[PDB]
Every structure is written in structure tokens, then in C-alpha cells.
Amino acid sequence: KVFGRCELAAAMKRHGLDNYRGYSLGNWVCAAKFESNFNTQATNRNTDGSTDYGILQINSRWWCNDGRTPGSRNLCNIPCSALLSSDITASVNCAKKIVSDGNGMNAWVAWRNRCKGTDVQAWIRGCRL
């Protein structure tokens, strides 16, 4: 599924991500924009053989099982394919664990490089939330 901006913001809020670990909804929408362009089915292989999955490009090196990332963990206790669903529940639950791991949203390099410090409220501007 390719979400619209306000549609994703609403879904994220519905799933408790709004201000989770102190990160406002716009931060999460911005991260999703630059990780996946709002596409739940986005996958991208990393140079090291892991793959990033879904709306928030969650990495198989630590967070989900894809069966082809030797030496890796599955800390979200989910198959990586669950992170590709139209329903964002699995991605949100796993993102909550990632953002709690110590470095906040800096875990998402694209958030650090493209969202951090910016006017992230623009991402929820106009949305009926």
C-alpha cells in the first residue's frame, strides 16, 4: 500500500506512535517519507547482505527474520515479511522497540540526515488528526 501523508499520520496516531519516546507525529511521517516514500512494500538490500523492510525500512541485521541474514538477530520476533503488510501494526510495534534501544530516532539514518532538526510539523500540516 502507498499511504497518503495525512492517511499515514492518522494510522500512526491510531497505533500510538504520536509522541512515542517524545517523537512527534511529524518526525515519524518524515521518517517514513524518506525511508519508503510511504510504500508498505518497500524493500532494499544493504551492502552487508541484510535487507530493510517496509514503511520504516526495518533491518534484518537485528530486528526481523528473513532467513538470509547470517549472524543476525530477530529482536522484534517477527518475519520480515510482516513488515510489508498494508496494516502497519507490525512495523509500528517493531519501531517502538527500535526507538527505545538507546539512540532514539537516529537508528533511522534517513531520519537523522533528512528530518532531524527540520520543520517536521509540515508533515502533518492540514491533517485532520
- CA–CA gap between residue 97 and residue 79 (Å, rounded): 15
Beta-carbon contacts of residue 125 (< 8 Å; ≥ 6 apart)? none
In the complex, the smallest distance separating the C-beta of residue 121 from Cl ion, rounded to whole angstroms, is 4
Q: Which residue lies nearer to Cl ion by CB, 17 or 120?
A: 120
Q: What is the pattern of x (binds Cl ion, CB under 5 A) and - over residues 27-66?
A: ----------------------------------------
Using CB under 5 A as the binding criterion, the count of chain residues that bind Cl ion stands at 11
69 binds Cl ion (CB under 5 A): yes
In 3D, which of 100, 82, 80, 102 has the Cα closest to residue 90?
A: 82
